[PDB]
Design a protein around this nucleic acid. Structure first.
Lengths: 73, 37, 229, 122, 119, 56, 115
RNA sequence: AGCGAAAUUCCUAGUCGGGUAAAUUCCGUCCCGCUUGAAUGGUGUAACCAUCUCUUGACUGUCUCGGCUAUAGACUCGGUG
RNA sequence: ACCUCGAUGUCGACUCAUCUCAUCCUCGAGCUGAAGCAGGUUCGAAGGGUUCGGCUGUUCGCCGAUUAAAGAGAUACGUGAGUUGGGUUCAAACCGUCGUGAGACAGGUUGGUCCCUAUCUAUUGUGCCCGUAGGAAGAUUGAAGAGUGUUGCUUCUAGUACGAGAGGACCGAAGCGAGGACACCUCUUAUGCUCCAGUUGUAGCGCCAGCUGCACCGCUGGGUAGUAACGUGUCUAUUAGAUAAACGCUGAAAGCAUCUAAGUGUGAAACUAUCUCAAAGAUUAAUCUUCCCAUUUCGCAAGAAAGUAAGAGCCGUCAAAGACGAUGACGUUGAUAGGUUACAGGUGUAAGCAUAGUGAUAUGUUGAGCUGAGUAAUACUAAUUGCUCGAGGACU
């Protein structure tokens, strides 16, 4: 059911991607847009969304920042 | 292949199936194979 | 991968006779022996590419940081450095030649920089067409026409992105696909490229192994004359 | 270069004086009458002593181009006039004996009868 | 628009270039526009390297390229160049004249230059 | 065309923030002291000490 | 940085013919075409007056004006074309590299040559 | 009497031939005449319209197919603005 | 009779084309009352392409002429701050009719009817500043992606399959390649108005030869580097993943068959791509490397003062850039550019010196004369003695 549909100001290349095709190229923008879908258009909207660092692995580049190891946050 | 809104037995052996949420009639003879039932 | 790259400076366009006693449009490009400044992997600097350094010149106008880049990669001072994208070969400190990278007449793809023309409109950039202007042409005489997409909010109420409007023509890299290689000359380190390739009298040319016809080769080599004075 | 309704010359025993391009047949939207392609033409001036008169639409094979094109052979493909042979609806022209040079690029589509009906091949 | 001031037409440009090279041959140095100064230097170098023969042939050829001025006319500039200007600087391969950059103009701030004759 | 709404006074000031000229060069003249421009003549009459101009 | 602009001819010198002249166009030259026919392999000459003298190496072209079977042909022949043999026949009295007074002559006549 | 789809006529894109490769626009003629028709003139007008309907030739960039060269310029700099 | 008449610019065309795909084609198969060579339907398919003219004025409507294809519609029955008024119909007039008339015909025709200096935004390129996460320094995984994403013809195959038999090939391979995008000036050309060679003179350089200011480059011819087509060269195709229409195999429900329901698959230019890519202002301001220093000392750290010892920039001969800035080669140390030699390339045997032709003109002087753009050497000249930005690794 749930494909992913996008159309920027560009036209002629309306992006329709299946679930299995998403796993082939990009996965961070998935959750990025999913979280930003709950953010009103304001000054820090795209500044709030960067706090959602989306990764496909268990590690991250901010381990030197003393991360709190937990689950389901 | 075809398009309809109801599928019924057409030939002598025209079995009714539910293929990809689409109710169809398919016969052992290739003639009587409709869609969209 | 299959991508093998060579660089050079185009000294202009010329002609020469190829096999089957036929002439082909020739762009003449001088090639300096290259040396690889790096092989960046998809996990080294996150990108798969090959950085080659060429055009060995005097160090008076070069970068001391580039000089140390050459030294720690075992190289000499070079004027130009360029990364070919989508490659993992060309081991560090290798003097590469087009003879081992291509065949004498194999199909390749050639990228080149267009002659600088400044800000030239989309009419000469995208090659629009103009109908007959008989019995009146209005106050202007040259225009690319309508970009109308909705008036008020009904369909778009904007101009569709990517609209071909007046801009820059020339000095834009263009890639022609599946063109055959005319001739090599390792004595003078020179290459002849078929077709009408971009480049002013002094432009640059990159040649890469074809990605649609890599092994396909047909002879357009130098053709001996049956009558020589 | 010959284009749409660009009148070109006839050099065979046909009974017509001038022929104007109406379209180009072969691939899609050639729009240019180059050597090696058969074109359709119309006659606006023709003597009544031949098998074709004014008002009809005929076919021709262009064999000579005055400006021409840069031929791949090595010499610029160039003639002294945009000349054609007004054919009898096939690869052969209406004249029983063909006079004048014949295009060497016609082999991409045939038109060998124009060359074979003449003693020379230029 | 339609008929107005002609401006810098090709015929006017070449006539002005001839006038400027004649002026730099007569007066020696010229304060003019930099783009005009460089063309004047080029033409002066060509004239100097052409006049080393001092024959009627060069007289006739340069007759189409000099325009008379206040001090020197065409055939007097002929003798002047053929006698003193050309042989004085022929001792070196080129560099028959030098152009140097000056400041802008009062009313229009046009970048000017000065052209002098030297070896 | 013509404007529908007026560009602001502050918008005008921000737009005119890049109409100013670019920076210039500086050159020391050895003989006649002056901080002239690069490959130009000074008020002392000399390009880099080549006496090629008058006093004014 | 470094420029040469001499390789333009160098690419053409690998198979350059030794004829390669630079003369005043307007002469009369005959060029032969070797038709390797199945029977009676033929040497079909193509003679005519020169019109334009251009070329920057192997691209040294010249126009030959012939007339066959009542139809004329002006071919921009290349000097270094394979299967083509080129010779110079007549050097007429010509003051240009583009003349047309030789094209407005009639038959049963002749032209004067340079003294 | 004469006239005709004629600047003209729903029917009408009248029709026939010609013009036009191509013809509802055009000519001659037969004329489906809301509607011809006689100084609101019927009607040819040789000559011609600073009007027009259409065809075409010598001839040309009007065009098939546009291109370069020089510019007043515009881009830049300065003075007014 | 409403958001809209203290207005909301419309018919049609050219151009720009895009999009949904209820598809024309390509791509793909099914069903086929499909005999085969080809295919009728169907859907998948927006991804691309998807005729020129004469005529009503015009694409369209008649006709002639085209390919596999010359799409079902919207974008104010798209377009008009991009263009046009083409005809009704302007201001005038006619023609047949009506009204005794101003005038009119849901009648026809000629004269003849459209403004935009773009503020933002949409948009195409180039910019200044700063951040650019130590200065500089090279290059990009990538964020929102777009363009070529269309594809035929010819030959053999093969007279063998299919039909049965005449009939009769796709299939497999090859080259040519047409729109579209791409660029070149190499051949050709148009130009080249700072090249040369002829040209009629006014009028001249006192005069004449030679030419001169001028006469559409005065005329036109060729033409330097060239610019562009009037030309050349490319490609699409194909393909991987998963699917669609489609076909399914075991196989249940239904002890049996049977594409989906659990398993096992293919499949299209349709989505990502595959041919082409590159972008950290991606403030998501990033990663790597390199030269430099990090010399004890002082913003809600600019590592403070020696803010380089490293690099770049300013500017010029210039363009390789380029709307202009920027950007870049070279910078008295130099071939980076201008001028000289040879001249590249091109014009095309200059001129008189004497003779021939009575004379126009030519000849030993001659492939010399010349080259404005341009080429290898050539400091001869220019690019300066020069100045500016410019580090202690910010924050973790």
């Amino acid at each position: 059911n749930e494909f992913w549909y996008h159309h920027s100001q560009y036209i002629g290349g309306i992006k329709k991607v299946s679930g299995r095709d998403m796993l082939k190229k990009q996965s961070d923008k998935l959750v990025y847009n999913a979280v930003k879908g709950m953010l009103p258009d304001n000054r820090l909207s795209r500044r709030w969304i960067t706090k959602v660092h989306v990764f496909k692995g268990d590690k991250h580049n901010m381990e030197a920042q003393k991360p709190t190891t937990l689950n389901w946050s | 292949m075809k398009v309809r809104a109801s599928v019924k037995p057409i030939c002598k052996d025209c079995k009714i199936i539910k293929r990809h949420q689409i109710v169809r009639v398919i016969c052992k003879t290739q003639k009587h194979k409709q869609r969209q039932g | 991968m299959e991508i093998r790259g060579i660089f050079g400076v185009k000294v202009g366009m010329s002609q020469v006779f190829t096999t089957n006693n036929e002439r082909l449009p020739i762009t003449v490009i001088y090639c300096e022996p290259n040396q690889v400044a790096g092989v960046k992997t998809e996990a080294k600097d996150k990108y798969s590419a090959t950085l080659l350094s060429f055009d060995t010149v005097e160090n008076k106008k070069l970068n001391k940081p580039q000089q140390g880049f050459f030294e720690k990669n075992n190289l000499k001072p070079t004027k130009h450095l360029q990364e070919i994208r989508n490659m993992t070969g060309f081991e560090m400190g290798q003097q590469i030649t087009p003879q081992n990278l291509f065949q004498v007449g194999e199909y390749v793809d050639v990228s080149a920089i267009s002659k600088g023309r400044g800000f030239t409109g989309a009419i000469k950039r995208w090659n629009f067409k103009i109908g007959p202007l008989g019995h009146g042409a209005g106050y202007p005489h040259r225009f690319q026409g309508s970009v109308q997409a909705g008036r008020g909010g009904a369909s778009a109420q904007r101009v569709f992105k990517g609209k071909k409007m007046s801009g820059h023509y020339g000095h834009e890299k263009v890639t022609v696909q599946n063109l055959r290689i005319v001739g090599f000359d390792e004595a003078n380190m020179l290459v002849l490229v078929s077709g009408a390739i971009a480049g002013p009298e002094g432009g640059v040319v990159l040649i890469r192994t074809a990605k649609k016809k890599p092994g396909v080769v047909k002879p357009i080599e130098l053709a001996v004359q049956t009558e020589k004075a | 270069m010959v284009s749409f309704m660009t009148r070109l010359n006839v050099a065979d025993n046909t009974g017509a004086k001038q022929v104007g391009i109406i379209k180009v047949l072969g691939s899609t939207r050639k729009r240019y009458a180059f050597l090696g392609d058969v074109v359709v033409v119309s006659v606006k001036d023709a003597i009544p002593s031949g098998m074709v008169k004014k008002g009809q639409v005929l076919r021709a094979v262009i064999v000579r181009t005055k400006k021409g094109q840069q031929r791949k052979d090595g010499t610029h493909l160039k003639f002294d006039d945009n000349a054609c042979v007004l054919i009898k609806e096939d690869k052969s022209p209406r004249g029983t004996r063909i006079f004048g040079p014949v295009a060497r690029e016609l082999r991409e589509r045939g038109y060998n009868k124009i060359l074979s009906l003449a003693v020379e091949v230029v | 628009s339609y008929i107005n001031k002609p401006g810098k037409t090709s015929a006017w440009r070449v006539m002005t270039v001839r006038q400027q090279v004649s002026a730099v041959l007569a007066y020696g140095k010229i304060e003019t526009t930099l783009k005009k100064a460089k063309n004047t230097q080029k033409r002066l170098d060509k004239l100097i390297t052409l006049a080393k023969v001092d024959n009627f042939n060069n007289r006739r050829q340069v007759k189409k390229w000099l325009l008379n001025t206040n001090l020197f006319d065409v055939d007097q500039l002929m003798d002047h160049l053929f006698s003193k200007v050309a042989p004085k600087y022929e001792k070196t391969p080129g560099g028959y004249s030098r152009v140097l950059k000056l400041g802008p103009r009062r009313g229009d701030a046009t970048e000017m230059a000065i052209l002098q004759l030297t070896d | 065309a013509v404007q529908q709404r007026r560009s602001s006074k502050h918008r005008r000031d921000k737009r005119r923030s890049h109409d100013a000229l670019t920076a210039q060069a500086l050159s020391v003249c050895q003989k006649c002291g002056k901080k002239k421009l690069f490959h130009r003549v000074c008020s002392c009459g000399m390009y880099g000490d080549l006496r090629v101009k008058k006093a004014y | 940085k470094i420029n040469k602009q001499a390789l333009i001819d160098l690419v053409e010198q690998k198979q350059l013919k030794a004829y390669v002249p630079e003369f005043s166009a307007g002469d009369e030259v005959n060029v032969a075409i070797k038709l390797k026919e199945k029977e009676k392999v033929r040497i079909q000459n193509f003679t005519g007056t020169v019109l334009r003298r251009r070329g920057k190496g192997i691209s040294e072209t010249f126009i030959v004006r012939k007339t066959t079977d009542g139809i004329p042909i002006e071919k921009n022949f290349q000097i270094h074309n394979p299967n083509i043999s080129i010779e110079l026949k007549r050097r007429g009295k010509v003051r240009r590299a583009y003349i047309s007074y030789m094209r407005e002559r009639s038959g049963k006549a002749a032209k004067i040559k340079e003294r």
